[PDB]
Amino acid sequence: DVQLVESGGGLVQPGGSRKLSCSASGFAFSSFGMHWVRQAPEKGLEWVAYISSGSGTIYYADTVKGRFTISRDDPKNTLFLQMTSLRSEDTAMYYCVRSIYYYGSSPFDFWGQGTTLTVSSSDIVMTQATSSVPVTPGESVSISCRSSKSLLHSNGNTYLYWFLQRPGQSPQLLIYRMSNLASGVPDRFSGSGSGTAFTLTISRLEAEDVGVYYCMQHLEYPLTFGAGTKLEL
Amino acid sequence: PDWKSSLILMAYIIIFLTGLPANLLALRAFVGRIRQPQPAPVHILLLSLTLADLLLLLLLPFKIIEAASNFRWYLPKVVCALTSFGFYSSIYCSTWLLAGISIERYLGVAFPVQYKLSRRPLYGVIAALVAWVMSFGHCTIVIIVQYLNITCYENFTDNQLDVVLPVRLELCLVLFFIPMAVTIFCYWRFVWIMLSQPLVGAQRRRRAVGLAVVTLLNFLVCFGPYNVSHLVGYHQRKSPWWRSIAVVFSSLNASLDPLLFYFSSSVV
Amino acid sequence: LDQLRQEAEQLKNQIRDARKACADATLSQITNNIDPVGRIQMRTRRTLRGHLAKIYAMHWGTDSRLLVSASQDGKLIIWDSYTTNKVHAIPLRSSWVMTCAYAPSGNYVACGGLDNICSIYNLKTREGNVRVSRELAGHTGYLSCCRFLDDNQIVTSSGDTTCALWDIETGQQTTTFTGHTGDVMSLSLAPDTRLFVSGACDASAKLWDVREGMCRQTFTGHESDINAICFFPNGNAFATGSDDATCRLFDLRADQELMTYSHDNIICGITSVSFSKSGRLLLAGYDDFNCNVWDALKADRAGVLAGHDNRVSCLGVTDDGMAVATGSWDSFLKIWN
Amino acid sequence: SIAQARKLVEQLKMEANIDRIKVSKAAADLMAYCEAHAKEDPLLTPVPASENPFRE
Amino acid sequence: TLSAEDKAAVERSKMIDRNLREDGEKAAREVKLLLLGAGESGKSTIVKQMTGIVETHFTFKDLHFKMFDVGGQRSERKKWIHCFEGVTAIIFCVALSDYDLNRMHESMKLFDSICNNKWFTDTSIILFLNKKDLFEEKIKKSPLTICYPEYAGSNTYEEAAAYIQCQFEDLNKRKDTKEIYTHFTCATDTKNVQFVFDAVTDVIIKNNLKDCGLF
Ligand SMILES: Cc1noc(C)c1-c1ccc(C(=O)N2[C@@H](c3ccccc3Cl)SC[C@H]2C(=O)O)cc1
Ligand SMILES: CC(C)[C@H](C(=O)Nc1nccs1)c1ccc(Cl)cc1
């Protein structure tokens, strides 16, 4: 039973320091690249940091570079994010995400529940024009995500992902590399597009499908998310 | 063309024409053996030796030019510096790499279990680097001191003899006698052990001691005369005139190694 | 009873007379006016390096990109052929493995050997590690070959002189195929997976009905042990490879041999056999450390895939027909094209 | 042993019962298949480099 | 020009490569032995001194031994014997008391088949002649002439011991490529492991000389 429980969040005074801890249980933590993804109180998702299997590769967002530091303790199955010089920007829920990379893998598959941090007072631009769209249960709807740069690579893999964050829940992976559907996702969800144009077509709308739909590129770091389209009614 | 120069002229050419193909054949074999599963420390060194030999054989034609030119350098002076540098650097890189092999032969038979247990190909790489660092690094320091101040380093001025000759003696003591003392010690005990260990067939017993002795002689016949010249030089306080002859022999080993290590193995 | 032994001989005579009767013209006579294939110039494109012991078996995925390989080191490696990348490396309980397979779906792999067990491995788990799904036990002898029909069905050959069909879910033999009188060495499913053929050390090949569980036909011709067998893409013929240094072509409908692939210089046996997508080329591994390419219709050598240093153990062709993989006892797979 | 010999006889009966086509026909049908699928085979007729995924 | 995900997939491949090399190094520091014998001819008892295949582990003087018994594998050996091409040595067991139990000749027939096998050209054989105490009691009762009619020497343990030894060593044809180490073990011994250690030491030395090129 895969689960990722984060801890180490609370009210921090500005310019301070705090460490987060993402405990892992029920999978080979050693052989899984890990990510950190934040979410500001009423905003979309923002990627923070990554650490590979073997701790042999690390990246950061430009907003945190120098300040934040990521590290993993494979024996104890725990991921860490040592944050320094905290700002009133950093106030966010921090999620802890697993990702495995081999031919025909499903990255960004499982997300943790998250932990709330409160600080007291060349990039590819993904665009979702529709902020919200009302829907009727039973009908079909299409979500549109545009890109600044063509996400098709020479190898022939269009690195465009889709996620769903249901009200009061952690984001769930739906579709990876434009078309390929994730496990435990009904066949109602379907994904298609071109180099820059993308469309997530949801058929037979269920009452459980309501939520915010994000689109993320994984062509090159930094990994960038969209604004998010909220289904309602 | 003096009758002296003629002999040096002929010798290098013979070393060039037999050595260069022999190495290239042996290189192919050794490269292949590294890519195959479970390589040994000695396989790394044997590769390293062959490369060190080639470098000398590829700079040997310039020495053939000298012998044809009757010891007078006509090429740009920058060539002389690089040619001579790579030549001597290779001699000493060979000297130390052979001392490296002598150890792996001793440990093989003196402590067979403890050799097997701790036989990671890492150590072979370390051993090869030390040989490169000691040989190329020693030469590098020297040539750096020169620039920061008709013959290709064979008419040193009386004033220069008060730095070139001291350095030559230093090269003899620590860059030949050290890897010599190792080599002699290893092959002395190696032969003594192979003739005291009786759980063997007679054919192997002779084959082994045979090649052990031939290797030790190669070492002392090829690299002996050149490193003795350094000493002779310091005592006389004058560059030995017969240095040019000694290098021929030190080069001969680049021709005589590939046969002794690879071609003799192919016979067996 | 002596009569039974005599009656058997009478039926064997009858069968021989029947198959002689329908023999009117040889394949050679018919394939005289067709033009030769020419010289087949293939070059090594990839060399998959990783195994630290003799490679005994390999098998392509259906995607025609991923392939699994087995070695005596005690490791299954799944390769990405295009990128020369290792996707999974599976440690095996028994290092002695003589076979491996890859499920058509691509969700499972199998292997076995001197353990007398066919071990199924689930590739796609939530835990993100390859784990043993089932260990199929029942065979008395070494597992010689294994091939999936489905995610829940696999058929195995063993040195106990039997083949067996399994229900992986329950882990039980559904039916046992008995008939051979020697160690069954190789196996080949028909395209439709309703029939399969098996070659044994009794110098005989047999056609099996998977569903009914009976020997439909028996094929004789080889002088020595049949080490390899493969089905012709049509599914109405198959090719064997034996220790008598010959490959042979049998058809099912006429129930007899058609063509023999022999060269006087060749004296070592065949390890492995496979067809091209068309079935115009018949590739064959040998013990002389090189694979040869035969014009399957004319029986003339067309090319040589020389490159390996040691015995060519296993040999496989992609489904798209684009490439050929040759494993060897030199611990290298080479992908030819 | 007697049952084994009997079992062999029963198997041989079944193999004798099957109908057989002429070799000429079977020979032609193998030829016909290889003629029809000649263009599909990449190894028989080397494909251009762009198509080959093993470039390298 | 690799994509983000492609580079990570390469990183994985490298880590796999690393762990394969480590498992290899560990395997190289282990002695692999093959155990053969005419039925149960003291294969069990020497295992105590230390189903398709059975594997045994024992360590002695910082050297790990893996012993494989292939008695349960009742199939044509020729079709899988090549798997053990590359074992350090082959331990062969003969019951010296099974001379009058024909079986000795069957053991001899098995012995020469292994000795003169194309796969085991340069593979040393550590012959054990088990059950010498019973044999010493058996020879005084029943003569060796039953087994070997050409035996002309006196029916004594010491002479017959050397005689049977000679018979097996004579079966060996390739006397240059490989060696045969013989030992007279019994049930009441504690020095059989030592004898294997001595024999294997010799085999290691030879392989060490092959790598250097002396050998
Ligand atoms: C120091 C210094 N300062 O002024 C001078 C002049 C020297 C000086 C020191 C040493 C030498 C000298 O003979 N060598 C050096 C050498 C020679 C040729 C090419 C490269 C190098 Cl490295 S190493 C081998 C040795 C030799 O060939 O026997 C000659 C000159
Ligand atoms: C002194 C002998 C053993 C030695 C020798 O024959 N070397 C060999 N290497 C390879 C094959 S034989 C030798 C070295 C130098 C000269 Cl000038 C003459 C003889």
Side-chain angles (χ1 to χ4, degrees):
Chain A
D1 188 64
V2 175
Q3 63 175 4
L4 288 164
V5 182
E6 302 86 339
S7 183
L11 184 64
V12 181
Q13 297 300 297
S17 58
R18 179 67 71 77
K19 192 179 74 174
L20 270 50
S21 298
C22 170
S23 60
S25 56
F27 69 98
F29 175 82
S30 178
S31 60
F32 265 87
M34 300 300 293
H35 296 260
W36 279 96
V37 175
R38 69 167 66 174
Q39 187 181 3
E42 294 182 0
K43 304 290 178 69
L45 306 174
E46 172 179 358
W47 172 85
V48 169
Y50 161 83
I51 184 167
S52 64
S53 296
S55 313
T57 300
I58 299 176
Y59 301 111
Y60 297 89
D62 292 294
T63 53
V64 299
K65 202 173 196 73
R67 300 192 300 127
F68 290 18
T69 304
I70 193 176
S71 61
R72 69 190 301 172
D73 183 11
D74 291 357
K76 283 288 182 182
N77 291 352
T78 310
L79 183 75
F80 304 106
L81 192 79
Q82 181 59 66
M83 306 177 298
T84 64
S85 181
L86 274 61
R87 304 171 183 179
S88 59
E89 177 179 296
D90 298 299
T91 182
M93 179 87 82
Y94 283 75
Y95 296 96
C96 167
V97 184
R98 72 176 195 164
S99 68
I100 195 162
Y101 299 100
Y102 53 79
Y103 176 75
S105 57
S106 180
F108 278 76
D109 48 300
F110 186 83
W111 290 48
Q113 289 302 118
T115 178
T116 305
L117 177 76
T118 306
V119 185
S120 60
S121 60
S122 59
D123 305 3
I124 305 173
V125 179
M126 308 309 296
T127 306
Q128 300 185 10
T130 306
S131 183
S132 59
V133 45
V135 296
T136 304
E139 292 187 358
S140 59
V141 72
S142 57
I143 316 300
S144 180
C145 177
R146 301 191 306 110
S147 183
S148 61
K149 181 181 174 71
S150 181
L151 300 184
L152 176 66
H153 198 266
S154 60
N155 54 52
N157 302 353
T158 309
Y159 304 104
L160 181 280
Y161 288 57
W162 281 99
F163 298 95
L164 162 63
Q165 188 177 2
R166 294 187 186 74
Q169 286 181 62
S170 180
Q172 179 189 353
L173 175 67
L174 301 183
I175 304 199
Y176 59 100
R177 305 194 193 77
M178 187 173 69
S179 60
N180 307 304
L181 190 75
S183 60
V185 185
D187 302 1
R188 294 181 298 114
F189 295 93
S190 59
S192 61
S194 185
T196 53
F198 308 106
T199 305
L200 184 84
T201 311
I202 315 162
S203 300
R204 288 73 173 180
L205 280 147
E206 198 175 62
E208 295 180 1
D209 294 5
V210 295
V212 186
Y213 289 82
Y214 298 101
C215 59
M216 189 202 76
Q217 68 82 9
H218 200 319
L219 179 67
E220 54 180 61
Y221 296 90
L223 313 176
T224 58
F225 286 80
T229 302
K230 178 183 66 60
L231 295 186
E232 54 181 356
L233 186 74
Chain B
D2 298 359
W3 67 329
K4 185 190 74 178
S5 299
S6 184
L7 268 68
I8 287 92
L9 181 158
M10 288 172 186
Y12 289 137
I13 288 169
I14 294 160
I15 294 160
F16 182 82
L17 291 171
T18 53
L20 180 60
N23 278 260
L24 285 163
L25 291 165
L27 186 71
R28 174 176 287 176
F30 293 144
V31 169
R33 172 58 265 198
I34 304 306
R35 312 195 81 170
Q36 285 175 3
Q38 316 293 3
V42 78
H43 293 142
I44 301 292
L45 293 172
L46 283 162
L47 177 74
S48 303
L49 172 65
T50 303
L51 289 164
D53 290 356
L54 277 175
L55 194 156
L56 191 151
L57 293 166
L58 295 182
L59 287 172
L60 200 64
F62 292 96
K63 218 61 48 57
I64 298 171
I65 291 166
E66 286 178 54
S69 300
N70 196 358
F71 297 96
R72 188 175 178 179
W73 193 258
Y74 290 130
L75 305 181
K77 291 179 180 178
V78 64
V79 182
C80 165
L82 296 175
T83 287
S84 296
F85 170 88
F87 191 79
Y88 298 123
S89 291
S90 179
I91 279 173
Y92 294 117
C93 193
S94 299
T95 297
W96 278 74
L97 281 167
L98 287 176
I101 293 170
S102 67
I103 299 162
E104 302 301 337
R105 291 180 164 190
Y106 166 78
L107 297 175
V109 304
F111 314 106
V113 158
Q114 292 89 309
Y115 177 75
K116 183 194 186 72
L117 268 45
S118 299
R119 197 188 71 126
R120 297 174 57 233
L122 171 74
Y123 305 112
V125 173
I126 294 165
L129 265 58
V130 169
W132 179 87
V133 161
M134 280 306 299
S135 56
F136 279 83
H138 224 102
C139 298
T140 298
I141 293 163
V142 166
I143 201 166
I144 260 65
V145 169
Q146 184 181 352
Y147 280 144
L148 279 73
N149 57 359
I150 60 165
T151 60
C152 186
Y153 295 109
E154 264 293 298
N155 192 63
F156 293 96
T157 63
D158 61 297
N159 309 117
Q160 287 169 1
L161 293 179
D162 300 358
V163 58
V164 56
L165 298 174
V167 165
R168 279 177 172 170
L169 176 142
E170 200 295 305
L171 285 160
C172 168
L173 290 205
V174 92
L175 221 76
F176 174 69
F177 285 169
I178 293 300
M180 179 187 72
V182 171
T183 300
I184 292 178
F185 166 81
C186 283
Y187 279 114
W188 174 252
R189 286 207 172 292
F190 174 90
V191 164
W192 150 286
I193 271 163
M194 281 288 97
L195 258 29
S196 299
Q197 176 271 110
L199 268 152
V200 268
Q203 212 303 118
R204 179 164 289 249
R205 207 184 197 137
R206 304 298 180 117
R207 165 67 68 239
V209 167
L211 265 43
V213 156
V214 175
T215 306
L216 180 65
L217 286 176
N218 275 7
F219 189 94
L220 292 176
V221 172
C222 300
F223 297 126
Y226 166 50
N227 282 113
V228 167
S229 73
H230 295 330
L231 299 167
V232 170
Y234 180 82
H235 181 80
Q236 296 183 303
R237 198 177 67 183
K238 182 184 178 182
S239 183
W241 67 273
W242 53 269
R243 281 188 70 252
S244 59
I245 282 82
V247 124
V248 172
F249 288 96
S250 301
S251 308
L252 186 70
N253 216 353
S255 180
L256 269 53
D257 288 316
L259 314 178
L260 181 62
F261 291 105
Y262 174 45
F263 290 40
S264 187
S265 171
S266 183
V267 164
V268 188
Chain C
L1 179 61
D2 189 291
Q3 184 182 355
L4 297 174
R5 299 163 68 188
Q6 183 181 357
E7 190 177 0
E9 187 70 8
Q10 292 175 5
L11 292 167
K12 288 176 74 68
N13 173 65
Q14 179 180 355
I15 288 164
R16 188 183 57 67
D17 295 1
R19 63 180 61 186
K20 178 63 180 178
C22 61
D24 59 299
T26 61
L27 182 62
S28 303
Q29 287 176 7
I30 310 301
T31 61
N32 196 6
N33 290 293
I34 60 164
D35 299 296
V37 301
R39 183 67 178 70
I40 302 296
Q41 293 286 355
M42 294 183 188
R43 298 86 179 180
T44 298
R45 305 296 187 180
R46 309 295 161 138
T47 304
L48 307 177
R49 324 180 95 111
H51 281 307
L52 300 169
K54 303 187 294 178
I55 295 163
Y56 266 65
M58 67 71 57
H59 199 217
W60 284 96
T62 306
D63 62 354
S64 310
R65 185 183 172 139
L66 296 169
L67 72 88
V68 64
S69 62
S71 177
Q72 298 288 102
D73 59 6
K75 295 289 179 291
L76 289 171
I77 303 171
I78 297 179
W79 312 81
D80 184 4
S81 299
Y82 289 12
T83 62
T84 315
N85 289 355
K86 298 176 179 64
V87 182
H88 299 100
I90 313 161
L92 310 172
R93 297 181 186 182
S94 178
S95 58
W96 319 103
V97 285
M98 300 176 75
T99 181
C100 67
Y102 210 139
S105 65
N107 307 317
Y108 295 95
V109 286
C111 76
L114 295 174
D115 61 353
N116 307 5
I117 291 168
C118 193
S119 303
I120 312 300
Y121 295 83
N122 189 5
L123 294 172
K124 300 181 182 179
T125 56
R126 290 229 72 188
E127 291 71 60
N129 56 351
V130 177
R131 55 177 59 180
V132 184
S133 186
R134 284 281 179 249
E135 290 189 299
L136 301 169
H139 279 309
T140 296
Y142 65 93
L143 207 87
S144 60
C145 194
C146 59
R147 290 290 178 244
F148 293 90
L149 295 83
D150 188 66
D151 295 4
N152 199 11
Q153 290 189 296
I154 190 164
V155 58
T156 57
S157 59
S158 176
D160 64 1
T161 312
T162 65
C163 298
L165 185 73
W166 303 82
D167 179 8
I168 297 169
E169 184 176 359
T170 56
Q172 297 298 120
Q173 289 183 0
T174 303
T175 180
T176 308
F177 308 94
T178 56
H180 280 306
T181 69
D183 304 4
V184 186
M185 293 310 300
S186 193
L187 211 75
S188 185
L189 273 286
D192 63 352
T193 66
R194 293 185 176 182
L195 299 90
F196 73 95
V197 287
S198 63
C201 293
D202 62 359
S204 182
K206 286 178 176 284
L207 181 70
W208 301 101
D209 186 357
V210 177
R211 194 169 184 174
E212 292 189 298
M214 56 175 286
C215 186
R216 194 157 295 290
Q217 294 179 61
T218 305
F219 295 93
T220 60
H222 279 306
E223 297 176 1
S224 307
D225 306 358
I226 304 170
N227 297 10
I229 200 160
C230 185
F231 237 106
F232 182 90
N234 185 14
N236 295 1
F238 68 93
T240 53
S242 68
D243 282 348
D244 70 2
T246 66
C247 297
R248 292 175 190 249
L249 188 79
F250 301 93
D251 58 359
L252 302 179
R253 291 185 291 175
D255 186 17
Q256 56 192 298
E257 199 189 311
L258 295 177
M259 192 67 89
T260 312
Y261 307 99
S262 63
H263 194 265
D264 299 298
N265 190 61
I266 303 169
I267 52 165
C268 71
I270 291 91
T271 51
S272 50
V273 151
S274 59
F275 275 101
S276 63
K277 188 180 179 70
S278 175
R280 181 66 185 251
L281 305 180
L282 174 67
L283 293 86
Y286 288 84
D287 318 302
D288 63 7
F289 315 154
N290 58 73
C291 169
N292 303 353
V293 177
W294 298 85
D295 184 354
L297 290 182
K298 279 198 162 292
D300 297 352
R301 288 174 70 184
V304 184
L305 278 35
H308 290 288
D309 308 64
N310 209 301
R311 177 187 292 232
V312 176
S313 58
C314 44
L315 169 76
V317 171
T318 57
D319 300 9
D320 62 359
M322 200 67 72
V324 182
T326 61
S328 174
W329 283 7
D330 63 7
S331 77
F332 293 124
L333 306 100
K334 287 183 176 69
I335 297 162
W336 308 72
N337 163 249
Chain D
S1 299
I2 300 163
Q4 184 181 358
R6 193 184 301 118
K7 189 181 181 70
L8 179 69
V9 163
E10 297 304 298
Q11 178 59 57
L12 290 169
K13 285 170 177 171
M14 294 292 182
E15 288 187 60
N17 290 126
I18 70 169
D19 58 351
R20 295 177 185 71
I21 70 167
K22 300 296 180 183
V23 169
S24 59
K25 179 173 176 64
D29 295 3
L30 296 186
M31 174 187 287
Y33 180 83
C34 286
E35 286 181 356
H37 295 74
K39 307 299 180 69
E40 295 187 7
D41 199 359
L43 298 173
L44 197 76
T45 56
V47 294
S50 178
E51 277 65 3
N52 168 49
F54 298 96
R55 302 161 292 242
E56 190 70 4
Chain E
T1 185
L2 296 169
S3 68
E5 295 191 6
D6 294 4
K7 290 181 289 184
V10 169
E11 188 173 0
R12 173 171 168 104
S13 186
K14 298 292 179 68
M15 283 189 73
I16 290 168
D17 279 295
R18 295 206 308 248
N19 295 301
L20 288 169
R21 289 184 295 108
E22 286 186 0
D23 294 1
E25 286 178 359
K26 185 181 175 291
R29 300 176 299 121
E30 289 170 356
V31 174
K32 297 191 300 301
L33 302 175
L34 176 66
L35 176 64
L36 307 169
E40 185 56 66
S41 62
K43 291 199 291 180
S44 182
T45 189
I46 69 92
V47 155
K48 307 307 179 185
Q49 294 290 352
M50 308 320 177
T51 52
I53 194 166
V54 175
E55 184 174 293
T56 310
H57 293 331
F58 66 102
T59 303
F60 184 79
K61 298 180 73 178
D62 309 1
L63 189 63
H64 290 231
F65 297 89
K66 302 193 293 181
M67 183 184 288
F68 320 113
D69 184 292
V70 292
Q73 191 62 244
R74 302 293 178 182
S75 59
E76 293 184 300
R77 296 190 314 266
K78 63 177 184 178
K79 283 289 153 189
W80 51 260
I81 197 73
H82 50 81
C83 297
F84 300 95
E85 182 193 3
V87 292
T88 303
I90 295 165
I91 294 170
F92 202 102
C93 293
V94 178
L96 209 66
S97 304
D98 294 4
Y99 72 105
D100 283 0
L101 186 70
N102 184 65
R103 266 186 51 106
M104 183 68 78
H105 301 107
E106 189 177 1
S107 309
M108 287 172 78
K109 284 168 67 180
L110 180 61
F111 189 75
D112 68 0
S113 298
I114 303 300
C115 298
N116 310 292
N117 191 0
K118 54 172 167 172
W119 305 115
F120 309 134
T121 46
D122 51 66
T123 304
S124 304
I125 290 171
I126 307 166
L127 176 70
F128 284 107
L129 298 175
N130 283 277
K131 305 176 191 175
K132 70 190 184 178
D133 288 3
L134 180 63
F135 168 73
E136 185 171 1
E137 295 176 297
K138 202 73 65 61
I139 189 163
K140 76 195 182 185
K141 178 181 176 181
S142 299
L144 184 66
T145 54
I146 307 302
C147 184
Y148 302 105
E150 49 270 298
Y151 183 55
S154 62
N155 302 160
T156 56
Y157 166 74
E158 185 61 62
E159 291 185 0
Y163 186 79
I164 300 163
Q165 172 179 298
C166 187
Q167 301 304 110
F168 281 93
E169 289 196 65
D170 290 359
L171 300 174
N172 178 47
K173 299 173 178 69
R174 59 196 64 162
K175 309 204 88 294
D176 300 295
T177 60
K178 68 178 189 66
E179 294 190 57
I180 292 172
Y181 317 105
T182 305
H183 186 92
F184 289 83
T185 184
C186 194
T188 56
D189 280 65
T190 184
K191 66 189 75 177
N192 309 126
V193 183
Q194 182 65 66
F195 179 80
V196 174
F197 189 80
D198 297 357
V200 168
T201 293
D202 299 351
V203 176
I204 299 161
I205 288 166
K206 295 176 209 303
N207 297 310
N208 294 353
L209 291 176
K210 291 178 187 289
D211 300 355
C212 299
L214 292 146
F215 294 88

